[PDB]
Amino acid sequence: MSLRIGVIGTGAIGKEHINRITNKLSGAEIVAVTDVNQEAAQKVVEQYQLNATVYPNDDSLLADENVDAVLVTSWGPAHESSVLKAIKAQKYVFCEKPLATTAEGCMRIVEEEIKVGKRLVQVGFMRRYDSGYVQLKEALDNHVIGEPLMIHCAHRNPTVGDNYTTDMAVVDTLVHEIDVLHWLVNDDYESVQVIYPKKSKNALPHLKDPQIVVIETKGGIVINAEIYVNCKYGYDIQCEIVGEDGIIKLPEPSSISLRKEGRFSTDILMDWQRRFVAAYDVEIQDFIDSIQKKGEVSGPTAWDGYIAAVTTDACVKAQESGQKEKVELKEKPEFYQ
Amino acid sequence: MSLRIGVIGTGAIGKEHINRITNKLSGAEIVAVTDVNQEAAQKVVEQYQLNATVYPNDDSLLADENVDAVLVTSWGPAHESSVLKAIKAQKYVFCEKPLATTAEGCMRIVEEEIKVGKRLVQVGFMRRYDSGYVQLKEALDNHVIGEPLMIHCAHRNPTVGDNYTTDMAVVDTLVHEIDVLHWLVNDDYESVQVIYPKKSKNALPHLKDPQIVVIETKGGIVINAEIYVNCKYGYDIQCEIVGEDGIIKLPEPSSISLRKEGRFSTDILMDWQRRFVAAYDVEIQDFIDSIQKKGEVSGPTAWDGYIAAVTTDACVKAQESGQKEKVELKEKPEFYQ
Amino acid sequence: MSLRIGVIGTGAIGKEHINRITNKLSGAEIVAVTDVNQEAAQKVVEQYQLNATVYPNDDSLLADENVDAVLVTSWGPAHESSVLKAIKAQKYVFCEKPLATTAEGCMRIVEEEIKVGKRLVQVGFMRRYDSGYVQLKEALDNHVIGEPLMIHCAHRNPTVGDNYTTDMAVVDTLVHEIDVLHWLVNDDYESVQVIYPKKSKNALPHLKDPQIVVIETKGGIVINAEIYVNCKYGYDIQCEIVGEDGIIKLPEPSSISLRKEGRFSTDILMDWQRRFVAAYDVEIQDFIDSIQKKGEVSGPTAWDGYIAAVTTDACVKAQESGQKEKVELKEKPEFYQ
Amino acid sequence: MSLRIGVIGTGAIGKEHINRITNKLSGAEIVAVTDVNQEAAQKVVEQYQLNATVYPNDDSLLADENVDAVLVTSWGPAHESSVLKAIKAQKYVFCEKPLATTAEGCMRIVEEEIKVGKRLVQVGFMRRYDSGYVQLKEALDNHVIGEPLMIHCAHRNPTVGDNYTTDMAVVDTLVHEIDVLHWLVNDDYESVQVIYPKKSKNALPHLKDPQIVVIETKGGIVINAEIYVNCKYGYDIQCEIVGEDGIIKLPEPSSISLRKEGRFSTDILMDWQRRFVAAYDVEIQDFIDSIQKKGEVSGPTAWDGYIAAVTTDACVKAQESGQKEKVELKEKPEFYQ
Ligand SMILES: [Cl-]
Ligand SMILES: [Cl-]
Ligand SMILES: [Cl-]
Ligand SMILES: [Cl-]
Ligand SMILES: [Cl-]
Ligand SMILES: [Cl-]
Ligand SMILES: [Cl-]
Ligand SMILES: [Cl-]
Ligand SMILES: [Cl-]
Ligand SMILES: [Cl-]
Ligand SMILES: [Cl-]
Ligand SMILES: [Cl-]
Ligand SMILES: [Cl-]
Ligand SMILES: [Cl-]
Ligand SMILES: [Cl-]
Ligand SMILES: [Cl-]
Ligand SMILES: [Mg+2]
Ligand SMILES: [Mg+2]
Ligand SMILES: [Mg+2]
Ligand SMILES: [Mg+2]
């Protein structure tokens, strides 16, 4: 059959996932939705022409015997509650970041999932499904460059809104690097340090931008991550991994080249939504296919959600202290190995 | 509803389209199949776990009131017959190349389609859906380089089988360039000339490889197309369009870069099936979506099939004559404008 | 000692060579000059602060026992006369293109040089000394790509003056490709054909621009050379050699890259004089060093001058006829092997 | 006349400069040499066929009224003595790094030079004369990217000898970055911190390799410099400057590209001596031309030597302490502005 999916939270993110499941992907259907604003959920069912029940809350949606799996796409601080309820209802769950707002909240989810005996929770770190990152992972797993030693990366954005604050550089922005890098190199984070260059003219007075975040792993890999969210020129993700015997680097997004007016050039995307559309499609298709074929999910795990929560909190601490701060992680359970 | 598709011809190509419709794309289902070898069609229904009727021939399949659209993926010389039957049965049809084996056969299809009053026929020239070609088309349509003047392109393949013959360099290989280029520049072909370099050591004695094909358009654009099907190093498509004021060029397929052992490098694909998988997915999704949203197809047309048939025949003539040969095209009907 | 050089022709080209010998290179000095306009030669001696005698003509300059070698940098049609006189006077001679205006004139020079028993004549085809071309030659000589099969090249210039005529596309412009390519692949030219695309809006009404020149070698290498002298965007030399097993390509001139305003770009030079300055320096330094160390010159030869004269004439014939034209070359003497 | 140069120290470095002055450059001659090993100096005069006097020491060489300028190319710790003697003898001096082994020694030279009233001392930081760095400087001076904010750079070498020690990563290797970067951005260094990744398998047990050096300028520019001297793959210099509105990056050294065996690649040099040969030539030619045309030198100054000495010492301190260390610089004299 089609995997029958319910959606908890019908804002921009939920709508985009509803659109991809309904109009782009294979093997699933939206059969149920809920939102805090019931009127909004009804509008969504109408706009996307869904054959779906509108439920007043997640408890009633999760009680629907004909819902197999849910997307948790509500307000971030509301995610944890729905994830816990879904685990208890024994539904598969795809949770947009964050899994929970604290390490403790992630640990509550971890404890309950481990009881189930199979993986129900996939966290929405879509970078792992981007073709460039998949290529990097394959090269590393094949020992192409020997042991990784250093990672140099950048997350650049053209401009941010007036409400974007210093902490969000790590909470909303660097969190993607935080998830993908430890996955690439199969190592755990140990410490973080934040350094502030000269503030850019393109940043509002309350915002510290750019920033450099230096992260060391337990194995001794050193990551230097630049975050510059008012770079003006484009939305740009760059990542180079220096190994003992060679160096691998993430590609530019594909663009025709142009020779014109004394310049040889390619395009730089301006819109972050154009950068990872394929990865979002693949991540959800993987959720669907893994469930149908394996009876459990296969992507970033609740434990990856925990690592992101602990590490982001340490980075925010380091933003304030100017000192090297410890990333204190519990031992990874065999369940998540 | 799901668009209900029947498949005529369940060989490798038909199977791959069945796989994408069943497991990758949105909005369609395989409800019927037929193959000359009925046992093969039954095996296909079983292998892909289809809920589909096996019909003994295309006439019976096309008589099924619950088939909305068909794929024609049979032996090439058999395509024309099924396309004509499908038009008469008023079904939408996606036809793999060729539309027909002769200009005359394509004209028979054109005459019958024009009677219908809407487009039923989409021909499987998937290059138009490749992101690089879409980018080229957008640049041209926006006048980025002024008038196109010259096109330099190459279609390279690592090695061919013992049964690949000189004519197939244009019939099976260059036909893709033949379709995409006139579309890019909105011009008609007027003449073709073939020049043979030194034969490669990598080619079998009966095969002329490489070849250069020089094509001139009515507007005066000159295309120099290299075909080298035993290039050894990779499967490689290259295309540069020189305009009055600048030059645009198709990108390399996306690859991580590597610094190792004194070389800075990216990957070249070895497998043509890895080069255009995304384009095949997009072309079929467009077939489905166009039908459901517009009630007619929107891709390469029966007329494009005709242009390909006329032009390939002229190229094969030029391969034999060593002279400049005319491409004689009827006026394009308003139906296809 | 310093090699004592006399200069015959003190126009722009002669002045630039005088400047490089006097202010940039090692091991030579300008001791004598002559120009048709004696006042101009005197001004040159003063402007460059030379310790040099001004002679009324080349005969008197060549009679100076203390002149070891001469540069022939006069009006093109005047070159042949001075080269012949210098050979008879037993001086080494560096001759700017052309060696002579006709195949017959080049053959007169060849006959007289062969009598000398050592190479006196170096022709000013500086591309052979450009680092990119040297790299191409090394790769070819090391069999990196197997046998060369095809060459795709372009010679592009931003705009030309009102006096630039169709024939000059081959006589003044393509002549550089004509010299360098047969050297790269160690093959002789056999035929040429000219094809005219759509005329560019950037070309004046009397000029055919762009042009494509197709040249076949005796060994069966096919060269497609684009000439576009009003391309607007830059001065740009491109060259790709397709071999049996791989492909080599001339590099872009070195430029920093820029990410800015949605584009990732490098520089394209606008000024042809910036493209080959290093090659001009190296070619003259080689003239000097070869003479001092070997007692004979080592660069492009009088025979290379002959090949250029024959081939340019065939191309101009082909420009007019629209037909394939023969390049008729005498057998290369052992003297020039 | 030719600038008459004496050479103090005829080892490998002195010999290479003698070779370039004698056989490659314009306007100077080697008229005098001295070495601690007089037999070595005599051999050098013979090997290079110099018309030069061999002096027993630098005092006697500097007393030669017919010596205009000297190269100081002796053992590093011996440089300071000869530079001071040359300033007192009122000769122009080109000094290979280091200017002196301590900040105090550099300050002694600075004090004596300032008395002269014109610049006599040029320090051999050749990177400033490399075409890529010149291009970076021009872009910065033209405000192409707005204010520089961050610099990401790497100095990589394939392997080092058994005698290469941890301190040399900054003293001999990073010193080049240390000189060029403050010049590029016209800012002073304020602090340095060293971080050690996982040790490479390619490094001997006594050596800490790779290393990351984080340098902050007074203006707030943050530099992250990777040093990896056993990277195996090549000798490789990389440098990216992130500005407010865009990013500029040093180019790869020019190389033909190759498509072969499934890879599209360019060359990475293995030999550091091939990386900067042009810069060494240009730096010495500039020394010669500046003296002859301006009567004083124009390259990196004694003050730049001082900055390098102070900064290298701070980096070595940071290598040992693991803490952020201050770079304590005296105010730059107007003499050196
Ligand atoms: Cl919270
Ligand atoms: Cl965009
Ligand atoms: Cl999980
Ligand atoms: Cl614990
Ligand atoms: Cl047929
Ligand atoms: Cl492949
Ligand atoms: Cl059609
Ligand atoms: Cl007609
Ligand atoms: Cl003449
Ligand atoms: Cl320029
Ligand atoms: Cl010669
Ligand atoms: Cl003969
Ligand atoms: Cl010392
Ligand atoms: Cl090398
Ligand atoms: Cl100084
Ligand atoms: Cl002080
Ligand atoms: Mg853009
Ligand atoms: Mg590969
Ligand atoms: Mg420019
Ligand atoms: Mg190499």
CB nearest to A248's CB, from B132, B135, B258: B258
Same domain, A72 and A192: no
The chains in contact with chain D, meaning 3 or more Cβ pairs closer than 8 Å, are A, B, C
Q: In chain D, what residues touch B252 (CB-CB under 8 Å)? A: 264
Q: How far apart are CA C100 and CA C106, in angstroms?
A: 5
**Could you tell me which of D73, D82, D81 has the C-alpha nearest to residue D280?**
D73
Q: What is the CATH number of the domain that holds C185?
A: 3.30.360.10
Q: Which of A254, A257, A265, A274 to mutate to test the interface with C (most CBs of C within 10 A)?
A: A265
- SS3 assignment, position A1: coil
The verdict on D199 and D79 lying in the same domain is no
| Residue B24 dihedral angles phi and psi, to the nearest 5° | -130, -35
Helix (H) or strand (E) segment spanning residue B87: helix B79-88
CATH number at residue D293: 3.40.50.720
Contacts of C233 in chain A (CB under 8 A): 259-262
Do A207 and A191 meet the contact criterion of CB atoms below 8 Å apart? no
| Domain final residue pick, A249, A266, A283 | A266
Cβ–Cβ under 8 Å, residues B208 and B166: yes
Q: Same domain for C228 and C274?
A: no
User: Are C252 and C297 in the same domain?
Assistant: no
Give start and end residues of each alpha helix (H) in C34-185: 38-47, 58-62, 79-88, 103-116, 131-141, 168, 175-185
Q: Is C70 helix (H, G, I), strand (E, B) or coil?
A: strand
Q: Which of C150, C213, C216 to mutate to test the interface with B (most CBs of B within 10 A)?
A: C150
Which residues in C157-251 belong to E strands, given as ranges?
189-195, 211-217, 222-228, 236-243, 246-249
Pair (D303, D336) in one structural domain: yes
Distance of CA A231 to the CA centre of its chain: 22
CB contact under 8 A, A258 and B145: yes
Strand partners, D271: none
Note the ligand closest to the C-alpha atom of B95: 7
C contact residues 224-253, partner A, Cβ 8 Å cutoff: 232-234, 236, 252
Cα–Cα distance for residue pair C261/C62, rounded to 1 Å: 60
For residue D331, how far is its CA from the centre of ligand 16 (angstroms)? 7
For chain B, the residue count is 337
* Domain end point (choices B266, B296, B319): B266
Question: A69 with A170, same domain?
Answer: no
Q: How far is A45 from chain B (nearest CA, A)?
A: 16
Give residues whose Cβ lies within 5 Å of ion ligand 19: A 262; C 267
φ, ψ for residue D136, nearest 5 deg: -60, -45
Largest CA distance in chain C: 64
Note whether C163 and C249 are same-domain residues.
Answer: yes
C197–B221 CB contact, under 8 Å: yes
Q: Taking CB atoms and an 8 Å cutoff, what residues of chain A touch D234?
A: none
Tell which of B266, B286, B318 closes a domain.
B266
Q: Does B27 touch chain A (CB under 8 A)?
A: yes
Pair A170, A127 in one domain: no
| Least CB–CB distance from A257: residue in B23, B251, B266 | B251
**Among C248, C260, C266, whose Cβ lies nearest the Cβ of D145?**
C260
Give me the resolution in angstroms, 1 decimal: 1.5
Same domain flag for D6 and D136: yes
Residue of C256, C264, C285, C293 best to disrupt the D interface, most CBs of D under 10 A: C256
Q: How was this structure determined?
A: X-ray
Q: What is the CA radius of gyration of chain D?
A: 20
Distance CA A33, CA B115 (A): 46
For the record, the structure tokens of C333 come out as 């003497």
Instruction: Give the minimum alpha-carbon distance from C200 to chain D in angstroms, rounded to a whole number.
Output: 31
Kindly report the nearest CA distance between residue D278 and chain B, in angstroms.
21
For ligand 2, the distance from its centroid to the CA atom of residue A137, given in whole angstroms, is: 27
CB within 8 Å: D144 and C258:
yes
How far is it, in rounded angstroms, from Cα D174 to Cα C208? Answer: 55
For residues C208 and C169, state if they share a domain: yes
In this structure, are residues A136 and A248 in contact, taking their beta carbons and an 8 Å threshold?
yes
| CB within 8 Å of chain A, chain D residues 147-166 | 147, 149-150, 152
Same domain, A180 and A216: yes
Closest partner residue to D249 (CB to CB) among C132, C245, C256 is C256
- Omega of the bond prior to C56 within 30 degrees of 0, cis? no
Q: For residue A251, give the nearest of B22, B255, B260 by CB distance.
A: B255
- Integer angstrom CA distances of residue D290 from B296, D73, D120, D283: 76, 20, 11, 10
* Residue B202 to residue C149: CA distance in whole angstroms: 12
For D233, the closest of B232, B252, B261 (CB atoms) is B261
User: At a CB cut-off of 8 Å and minimum separation 6, what does B135 contact?
Assistant: A255, A256, B251
Residue A122's DSSP bridge partners are A94
HEC string of chain D? CCEEEEEECCCHHHHHHHHHHHHCCCCEEEEEEECCCHHHHHHHHHHCCCCCEEECCHHHHHCCCCCCEEEECCCHHHHHHHHHHHHHCCCEEEECCCCCCCHHHHHHHHHHHHHHCCCCEEECCHHHHCHHHHHHHHHHHCCCCCCEEEEEEEEECCCCCCCCCCCHHHHHHHHHHHHHHHHHHCCCEEEEEEECCCCCCCCCCCCCCCEEEEEEECCCCEEEEEEECCCCCCCEEEEEEEECCEEEECCCCCCCEEEECCEEEEECCCCHHHHCHHHHHHHHHHHHHHHHHHCCCCCCCHHHHHHHHHHHHHHHHHHHHCCCEECCCCCCCHHHC
**Residue contact A262–C252, C-beta within 8 A:** no
Among the partner residues B24, B131, B248, nearest to A258 by beta-carbon distance: B248
Nearest to D314 by CA among D175, D200, D202: D175
Same domain (yes/no): D207, D294: no
Q: Which residues of D touch B259 (CB under 8 A)?
A: 233-234, 236, 268
Closest D-chain CA to C252: D254
Residue-wise DSSP of B216-252? EETT--EEEEEEETT-SS--EEEEEEEESSEEEEPPP
Select the residue from B261, B263, B270 to test the D interface by mutation, using most D Cβ atoms within 10 A: B263
Chain A touched by D260 (CB under 8 Å): no
- Write out the two tokens for C38: 């004696």
Length of chain A, please? 337
Give me the domain span that covers residue D132. 2-143+267-337
Rounded CA separation B30/B2 (Å): 10
Count: domains in chain A: 2
Q: How far apart, in whole angstroms, are the C-alpha atoms of residue B313 and residue C283?
A: 51
Closest CA relative to residue D234, chosen from D279, D196, D267, D197? D267
Which chains contact A through at least 3 pairs of Cβ atoms less than 8 Å apart? B, C, D
